[PDB]
Enzyme design. Structure first.
Site, mmCIF file in Angstrom:
data_model
loop_
_atom_site.group_PDB
_atom_site.id
_atom_site.type_symbol
_atom_site.label_atom_id
_atom_site.label_comp_id
_atom_site.label_asym_id
_atom_site.label_seq_id
_atom_site.Cartn_x
_atom_site.Cartn_y
_atom_site.Cartn_z
ATOM 1 N N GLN B 71 0.831 -1.225 0.130
ATOM 2 C CA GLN B 71 0.040 -0.013 0.020
ATOM 3 C C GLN B 71 0.935 1.165 0.004
ATOM 4 O O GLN B 71 0.292 2.271 -0.262
ATOM 5 C CB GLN B 71 -0.965 -0.092 1.224
ATOM 6 C CG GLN B 71 -1.895 -1.054 1.170
ATOM 7 C CD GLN B 71 -2.894 -1.146 2.403
ATOM 8 O OE1 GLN B 71 -3.013 -1.976 3.116
ATOM 9 N NE2 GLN B 71 -3.953 -0.193 2.106
ATOM 10 N N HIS B 173 0.801 -9.115 4.912
ATOM 11 C CA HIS B 173 -0.065 -8.218 4.726
ATOM 12 C C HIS B 173 -0.672 -8.350 3.364
ATOM 13 O O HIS B 173 -0.735 -7.453 2.535
ATOM 14 C CB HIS B 173 0.196 -6.924 4.884
ATOM 15 C CG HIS B 173 -0.746 -5.957 5.403
ATOM 16 N ND1 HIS B 173 -0.773 -5.291 6.367
ATOM 17 C CD2 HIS B 173 -1.967 -5.569 4.697
ATOM 18 C CE1 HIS B 173 -1.934 -4.660 6.442
ATOM 19 N NE2 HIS B 173 -2.578 -4.713 5.608
ATOM 20 N N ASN B 220 -1.613 -9.912 8.898
ATOM 21 C CA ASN B 220 -2.710 -8.908 8.855
ATOM 22 C C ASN B 220 -3.962 -9.291 8.668
ATOM 23 O O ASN B 220 -4.307 -9.620 7.389
ATOM 24 C CB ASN B 220 -2.273 -7.518 8.129
ATOM 25 C CG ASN B 220 -3.205 -6.509 8.244
ATOM 26 O OD1 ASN B 220 -3.060 -5.784 9.260
ATOM 27 N ND2 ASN B 220 -4.181 -6.501 7.473
ATOM 28 N N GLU B 221 -5.008 -9.362 9.608
ATOM 29 C CA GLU B 221 -6.643 -9.433 9.364
ATOM 30 C C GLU B 221 -6.755 -10.787 8.648
ATOM 31 O O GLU B 221 -7.203 -10.728 7.380
ATOM 32 C CB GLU B 221 -7.056 -8.428 8.638
ATOM 33 C CG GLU B 221 -6.912 -6.930 9.535
ATOM 34 C CD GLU B 221 -7.678 -5.946 9.100
ATOM 35 O OE1 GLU B 221 -8.669 -5.853 8.105
ATOM 36 O OE2 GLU B 221 -7.719 -4.754 9.781
#
Ligand SMILES: *[C@@H]1O[C@H](CO)[C@@H](O[C@@H]2O[C@H](CO)[C@@H](O)[C@H](O)[C@H]2NC(C)=O)[C@H](O)[C@H]1NC(C)=O
Ligand SMILES: *[C@@H]1O[C@H](CO)[C@@H](O[C@@H]2O[C@H](CO)[C@@H](O)[C@H](O)[C@H]2NC(C)=O)[C@H](O)[C@H]1NC(C)=O
Ligand SMILES: *[C@@H]1O[C@H](CO)[C@@H](O[C@@H]2O[C@H](CO)[C@@H](O)[C@H](O)[C@H]2NC(C)=O)[C@H](O)[C@H]1NC(C)=O
Ligand SMILES: *[C@@H]1O[C@H](CO)[C@@H](O[C@@H]2O[C@H](CO)[C@@H](O)[C@H](O)[C@H]2NC(C)=O)[C@H](O)[C@H]1NC(C)=O
Ligand SMILES: *[C@@H]1O[C@H](CO)[C@@H](O[C@@H]2O[C@H](CO)[C@@H](O)[C@H](O)[C@H]2NC(C)=O)[C@H](O)[C@H]1NC(C)=O
Ligand SMILES: *[C@@H]1O[C@H](CO)[C@@H](O)[C@H](O)[C@H]1NC(C)=O
Ligand SMILES: *[C@@H]1O[C@H](CO)[C@@H](O)[C@H](O)[C@H]1NC(C)=O
Ligand SMILES: *[C@@H]1O[C@H](CO)[C@@H](O)[C@H](O)[C@H]1NC(C)=O
Ligand SMILES: *[C@H]1O[C@H](CO)[C@@H](O)[C@H](O)[C@@H]1O
Ligand SMILES: *[C@H]1O[C@H](CO)[C@@H](O)[C@H](O)[C@@H]1O
Ligand SMILES: *[C@H]1O[C@H](CO)[C@@H](O)[C@H](O)[C@@H]1O
Lengths: 543, 542
Positions: B71, B173, B220-221
């Site tokens: 990102q 991620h 992540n998540e």
């Protein structure tokens, strides 16, 4: 009926006709009308500062909302109304001047006002600000009177009082009669037929309504109104000797004359016991900006020139020494007709109350090319104020950070400048003192891109409008208690999303949402309406 | 690299190639770097309540920002990086899955990070949370190691510590190695090669950075990630026996195994003294929603189902009794591979610390056709949670008013629900206890239509992001003092406007603006960054 009215509407409806609302009868408010449920109890937490704990506005404080006839009524051809210049503009140039909207229906307030009033009573509003449509009273601006129009406002006023809303009437809120524009250029009139025609109109509404309406505004924001006369459709029918620059200042003169003469009539009606005793003035707008660089003499000069051209040019002939401010005269000269001593006799002292539509305060940067160089050149883009007028300057400190939160960029003039409210009020009441005090007569928020929400729950939790209303009210309260300002009332623009002139229904100023995709134009409370309600419950005297 | 790296990128670049940033070299921060001036001193008044005056976070509180490699980094092809499934996805389906963006450049943090770190120091940030790009370390997911990738994070971590930012590292991620997806379906692997490959990768980065990085997250998540595996590009390469629905729970199983085995390797490296002793976990997200009608047993059951599928399915195997939630097993059956006794040996207790990306709390309305009718029907629009999942339900009380302020409508899952933070943390620490406490590992605001602003002064006074960050931090500060939550830090998403997955650079989450129209991608503090800075000054021990 009248043949010239029919011809005027024919002219308006030539490309396309007036559309009619789904509801064309007066609404009945059932005794059982169910209001939508309150927001959760924690919703209003954190907006009110402990700085204002326990403080109240003066007894009799007018805690209210504001609308304008053409912005909320609809019913543009109903019950004998004649066209205004806006009805013409948006039926001929909607795609380039009216954002593809028109004021044919707007919020349908003309038929929904009993329900609107009931909803306002639910919130604890005690004052209802409205304007009268001139062309509902005189469909051709002068000549015959439309009784159905006069009777309509009797019913509105009566309904308002029934719901506990003190009525505050504006005589003229920008809806210039088309007939008068065609016949002699309306506010561009080089003679004085416009004053006479406005006086006849105002006299009629004073007599009809003065017993019920005891606070009057002749003109809403005359400086903003006269600046629009520089364009369409006004500049289709300029009287010779007038062009789009002089048209602004010929409008200023004619408007001051109309206001002074109307005020003399009003005072004759009060002094003779023809109508109830009441107070009258007009609604100023804008601000005395802060200089971009503190103690910079050019920025102070442009700031003063901002106030002069934006407030002083109307306020000083009325509440001042009776003349235009000296800097306005030195810059526009023969385009701004001198105030004969007869003129000043009518106009000086013609303001019982001051009113400021105090949406915001700006920042003044002196013209980058020099003020002297700018005021000489009517073609300079910063003429006549000769501050840098564009948004990158008018809201921005030398730091490059803004004075405050911006609202929707289509109304980029609007910011949240609440910390500056008290100094605006101090300046205005010391400079334009009125025996009856000062109203904060319009202030409201256009939540960014609220028009792009599709789901109701996303619309109604309107944080930045809630913040703006609370911030502004808090500063008004403190202006009373800490500055001793004779603050008479607080009127938020507006109680509903409405037809915002050139932007039409796209721009959303209401503390209630109006569903334009619903035939009934259902209202829904936004969080800001409840924040307004709670503030009045906490800070009005109720005993 | 190999000719297989060239082939994979040739595949990714087959319609249009990877674009390059105007700046392709590491920047140096001049000693005379001039930060933009502060907002007016009245700008922050009124955000902080007296409820929190004098209160301070615990000593050593990690007060920080978060980003993710794909990102913020850019440099998608530079220094030997291999492509991820997102590089493929957005170079091939950009107009329908990526909002006509791609992560070729994003914020160019790969070359700009020293300047970014100087600006974070000016804010008094003390913690920098970042993810490592798997395909910068193994360009093919497996096989050869790209030393220039490893050296890059060495320098990032070193630059971070130099500017006073404690580095917090996430292993994965969402940036799945494209090679592994083509070869055996990546996280849909019906064997266990994905677990071996992830563990070899985790090992390599643990060894390389574990002396400088003492707080680790494997994933992540993982629930959100695994939900993407139902779609492109993952559903072009499902193994036999996997479909778009089971791919989610095959992903869920393999991630849990990959996490357990990686944590095992982490502990062995710590026990043997190869790396500094630290703490490892993973980042949960989502929430245990409130029921729409209090005391309604249907709403309370769908709320429990929400927590079970959103949090419990990873949290219970790691921090709880070591198995999946019962309601999850009863509804999903054999799509979710059972946890063997050996599995549980790795997975259970493999979490030193809990972390919640606590953006939001929802409202749960039981499915209108009835929960029993929905759980039995995989075609039901509300399967498997069997609450009404759409926005007019997930955020709205029966009254019709919302739980809180909505953010930008393109991320409608986000609302400001700060009043509910303390209840979320109570539930999480009581149900998924971790010795090391709990992190608030991501939260942030997408200011509505900030992307349609054209003048900078209108962007930077960002009222609802400023309100959101302060509301959330305030409730976190109260959770510590009134509730005794072992809250280990607060990492806000994000420090820069960045590449927001399928929305690309349109959605704005930074407390700094990034000028995508400017070749240097200049950063400007918004008011929220200063609000974050001031909260740190008022409420961190010094
Ligand atoms: C009458 O006033 C209108 C304002 O509504 C003027 O409209 C402008 O037309 C010029 C022509 O080049 C455009 O460049 C401007 O953008 C228009 N202004 C706006 C705000 O629309 C019109 O030019 C004026 N006409 C006369 C006869 O002066
Ligand atoms: C609009 O009218 C005004 C006034 O007639 C024009 O401004 C004047 O232009 C003359 C040039 O012959 C100047 O010398 C005057 O001093 C200016 N007016 C005043 C009184 O200040 C303006 O240019 C006219 N035409 C436009 C703007 O198109
Ligand atoms: C605005 O009002 C409209 C009409 O009352 C609401 O929309 C309708 O909802 C039905 C659902 O049964 C749709 O199938 C219709 O197509 C809609 N009518 C339209 C689009 O004309 C809508 O919910 C209201 N909007 C808000 C924000 O409250
Ligand atoms: C692979 O997953 C993608 C998700 O990106 C699926 O895309 C859907 O395609 C169907 C059929 O055209 C559409 O109705 C949906 O709107 C799409 N979902 C999106 C883009 O949100 C695709 O269907 C899947 N392919 C297979 C083989 O199931
Ligand atoms: C994907 O595969 C799963 C594997 O079970 C399918 O789920 C089965 O669906 C059938 C018919 O709907 C049921 O009889 C079985 O009970 C289901 N299995 C389980 C374990 O519940 C699912 O239908 C498949 N879906 C698609 C779209 O391929
Ligand atoms: C007046 O201003 C216009 C617009 O800036 C400019 O082109 C022209 O040169 C100016 N004239 C003088 C006399 O300054
Ligand atoms: C399952 O859900 C679908 C909705 O996609 C519905 O049409 C169907 O009737 C439901 N029940 C079944 C398949 O038994
Ligand atoms: C972005 O950068 C461009 C080019 O430098 C500049 O012209 C523009 O004003 C900037 N936009 C901002 C700051 O919003
Ligand atoms: C709809 O009906 C109204 C009367 O209520 C007209 O004024 C309009 O012209 C349209 O026919
Ligand atoms: C109001 O006006 C419309 C026409 O304009 C009628 O259809 C309606 O019944 C009511 O009379
Ligand atoms: C006015 O009256 C009409 C009946 O003629 C209604 O249909 C309308 O809704 C309004 O109440």
């Amino acid at each position: 009926g009248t043949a010239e009215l029919d011809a005027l509407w024919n002219l308006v409806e030539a490309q396309y006709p007036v559309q009619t609302a789904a509801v064309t009868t007066l609404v009945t408010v059932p005794d059982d009308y169910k209001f939508e449920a309150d927001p959760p109890s924690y919703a209003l937490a954190g907006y009110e500062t402990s700085e204002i704990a326990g403080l109240k506005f003066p007894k009799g404080f007018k805690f209210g909302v504001a609308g304008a006839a053409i912005q909320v009524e609809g019913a543009a051809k109903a019950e004998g109304r004649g066209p205004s210049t806006w009805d013409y503009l948006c039926h001929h140039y909607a795609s380039t001047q009216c954002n593809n909207y028109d004021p044919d229906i707007t919020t349908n307030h003309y038929y929904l006002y009993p329900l609107d009033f009931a909803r306002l009573q639910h919130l604890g509003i005690n004052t209802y600000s409205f304007s009268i449509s001139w062309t509902r009273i005189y469909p051709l601006g002068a000549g015959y009177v439309n009784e159905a129009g006069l009777a309509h406002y009797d019913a509105v006023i009566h309904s308002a009082k029934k719901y506990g809303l003190e009525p505050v009437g504006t005589v003229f809120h920008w809806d210039t009669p088309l007939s008068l524009m065609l016949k002699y250029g309306a506010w561009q009139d080089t003679g004085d037929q416009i004053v006479k025609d406005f006086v006849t109109y105002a006299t009629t509404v004073f007599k009809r309504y003065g017993n019920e309406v005891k606070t009057w505004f002749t003109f809403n924001e005359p400086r903003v109104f006269c600046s629009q006369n520089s364009g369409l459709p006004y500049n289709l029918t300029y009287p010779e000797g007038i062009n789009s620059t002089s048209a602004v200042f010929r409008c200023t003169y004619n408007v001051l004359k109309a206001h002074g003469h109307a005020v003399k009539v009003y005072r004759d009606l009060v002094a003779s016991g023809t109508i109830a005793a009441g107070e009258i003035g007009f609604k100023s707008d804008d601000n005395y900006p802060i200089p971009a660089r503190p103690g910079n003499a050019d920025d102070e000069e442009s700031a003063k020139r901002h106030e002069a051209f934006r407030i002083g040019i109307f306020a000083q002939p009325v509440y001042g020494n009776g003349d235009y401010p000296d800097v306005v005269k030195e810059t526009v000269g023969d385009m701004l007709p001198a105030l004969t001593d007869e003129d000043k006799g009518y106009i000086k002292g013609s303001g019982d109350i001051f009113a400021i539509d105090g949406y915001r305060t700006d920042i003044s940067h002196a013209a980058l090319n020099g003020i002297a160089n700018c005021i000489r050149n009517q073609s300079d883009p910063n003429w006549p104020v000769c501050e840098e007028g564009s948004d990158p300057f008018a809201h921005v400190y030398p730091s490059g950070f803004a004075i405050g939160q911006s609202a929707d960029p289509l109304s980029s003039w609007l910011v949240n400048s609440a910390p500056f409210i008290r100094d605006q009020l101090k300046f205005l009441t010391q400079t334009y003192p009125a025996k009856g005090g000062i109203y904060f007569s319009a202030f409201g928020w256009a939540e960014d891109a609220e028009y792009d929400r599709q789901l109701l729950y996303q619309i109604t939790w309107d944080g930045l409008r809630t913040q703006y209303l609370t911030d502004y009210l808090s500063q008004l309260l403190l202006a009373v208690h800490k500055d001793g300002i004779n603050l008479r009332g607080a009127l938020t623009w507006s109680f509903v999303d409405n037809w915002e002139w050139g932007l039409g229904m796209q721009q959303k100023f209401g503390f209630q949402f109006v569903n334009q995709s619903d035939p009934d134009l259902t209202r829904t409370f936004k969080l800001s309406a409840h924040a307004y309600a709670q503030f009045g419950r906490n800070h009005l005297h109720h005993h």
